[PDB]
């Protein structure tokens, strides 16, 4: 079927929306620009194709394995009050005279509401359900990309959806998949499994596999293996109940329909802004590649899987041979309806590989002992910081990315150097704020970071000192080309930072003490003082 037809309705905002960004941080501001509904129709373009699929007894086998293991699975359903408890405080607020405030505090209005909703599941499997559809505002850095297409139902739903499935999607893709599950290791944990897998193998090849607009890929057949898989688990038979009607009227297809109310279309494929979304692309990314591995004759190969991002390590053929697989490989994928972005190319360096737009690189200890890391181009956190210094946003892309990437070169003397000199110039260091994991909402207090930041990462990460050249130029580079600071500058600022943080005792001297310790040249000695990198929640609608 066609994954998407359009009636002719515009994809429409909700209020302004700035593309546009309004310094001591960057100085090409018009190298910074966010996506906007303008650029929806170019995108609504790239979306949309027929899906021809053809399965063979690979994709049969590994479905048949995955089942087996999905079996001894047991989930149970969650209350209402769990399930409102799980909503943002800022969720879009439903259609029907209710809000995620109300739903957060378990008024009676917004819960006989959710109420009805699911009565309606258990009876009524068939009539589709309505979701809205938007183009997101996602910033970036020049050289261009059109807005992605959020789609996603009303809140009553969506806490429906939380009691159906949360726990089976917090718990089940671990156990089909195990060491392969994307979302269970934390950026420490990911390195350890990369590069252990690599010196596993007596000679070993790598690629990363870019499927182009996985969402659109993902058929009404894919999502209906993927219940069959769900309902495997051992389940209350009203659960079973719901997940029939939701996949049916929900997972499988629907209306869309513009921020005005317009009928804008119909959908056929994946629905970004739905709970099953991280789960399912990562159970059909898992299956399909899998099962191309099996055709191409790849040779003990260990896969790793965040929703649509693959990674393979395996035994090499040789350079000949290898660049061969990959190709059958690509056919399988193709065959699976999971065609290519770029094409996959063989590498044979941990360092060169990419997978989750993150790679790792090694760099030294207090001790001079090698220490590996994971980083990534700063280009996109830099932006982001860029802009959200500017224009103010709930949303904190600087501080998911200090946490993630904590030991990196970038995060520590430009992200921690920058938001630091913000927050003690504001005073607004006590206070919490909210950020992204793993597509889960949040809420920390940027003084705890030294903790959180030696319980993910180790003290190496307070004092990591001799960064490979390529890194370094890779960091120098992507300074110059947006025009920031060079990083002699940032020393001086950090050094200022510091003290001023220093002085004020507590938290904010063990801040200072810790983050900055890079910056002072006699260095002080370092000593010592979560369910979150547990499972992938994007678009999922989940805060903890
Ligand atoms: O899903 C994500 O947004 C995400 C995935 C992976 C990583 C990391 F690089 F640490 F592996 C970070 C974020």
Known sequence: SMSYTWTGALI?????????????????????????????????????????????????????EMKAKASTVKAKLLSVEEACKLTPPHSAK????????????????????????????????????????????????????????????????????????????????????????????????????????????????????????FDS?????????????????????????????????????????????????????????????????????????????????????????????????????????????????????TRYSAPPGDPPQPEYDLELITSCSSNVSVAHDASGKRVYYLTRDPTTPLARAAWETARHTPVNSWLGNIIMYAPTLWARMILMTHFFSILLAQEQLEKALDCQIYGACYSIEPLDLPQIIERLHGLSAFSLHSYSPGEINRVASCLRKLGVPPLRVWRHRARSVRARLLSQGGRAATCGKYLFNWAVKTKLKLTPISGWFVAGYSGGDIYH
């Open 12 to 64: 429409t905002p909700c209020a302004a929306e700035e593309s546009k960004l309004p310094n001591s941080l960057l100085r090409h501001h018009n190298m910074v620009y966010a996506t906007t509904s303008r650029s929806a129709g170019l995108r609504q373009k790239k979306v949309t194709f027929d899906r021809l699929q053809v399965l063979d007894d690979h994709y049969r086998d590994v479905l048949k």
């Open 94 to 213: 439903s259609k029907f005279g209710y809000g995620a405030k109300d739903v957060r505090n378990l008024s009676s209005k917004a819960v006989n509401h959710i109420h009805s909703v699911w009565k309606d599941l258990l009876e009524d499997t068939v009539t589709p359900i309505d979701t809205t559809i938007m183009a997101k505002n996602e910033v970036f850095c020049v050289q261009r990309k059109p807005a992605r297409l959020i789609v996603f139902p009303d809140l009553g739903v969506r806490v429906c959806e939380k009691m159906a499935l949360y726990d089976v999607v917090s718990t089940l893709p671990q156990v089909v998949m195990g060491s392969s599950y994307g979302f269970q290791y934390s950026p420490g944990q990911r390195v350890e499994f990369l590069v252990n897998t690599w010196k596993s193998k007596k000679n070993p090849m790598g690629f990363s596999y870019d499927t182009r607009c």
């Open 217 to 333: 890929t993902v058929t009404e057949n894919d999502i209906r293996v993927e219940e069959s898989i769900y309902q495997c688990c051992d389940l209350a038979p009203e659960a079973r109940q719901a997940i029939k009607s939701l996949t049916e009227r929900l997972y499988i297809g629907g209306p869309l329909t513009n921020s005005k109310g317009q009928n804008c279309g119909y959908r056929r494929c994946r629905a970004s802004g739905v709970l099953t979304t991280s789960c399912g692309n990562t159970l059909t990314c898992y299956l399909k590649a899998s099962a191309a591995c099996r055709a191409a004759k790849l040779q003990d190969c260990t896969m790793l899987v965040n929703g649509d991002d693959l990674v393979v390590i395996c035994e090499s053929a040789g350079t000949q041979e290898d660049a061969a697989s990959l190709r059958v490989f690509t056919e399988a994928m």
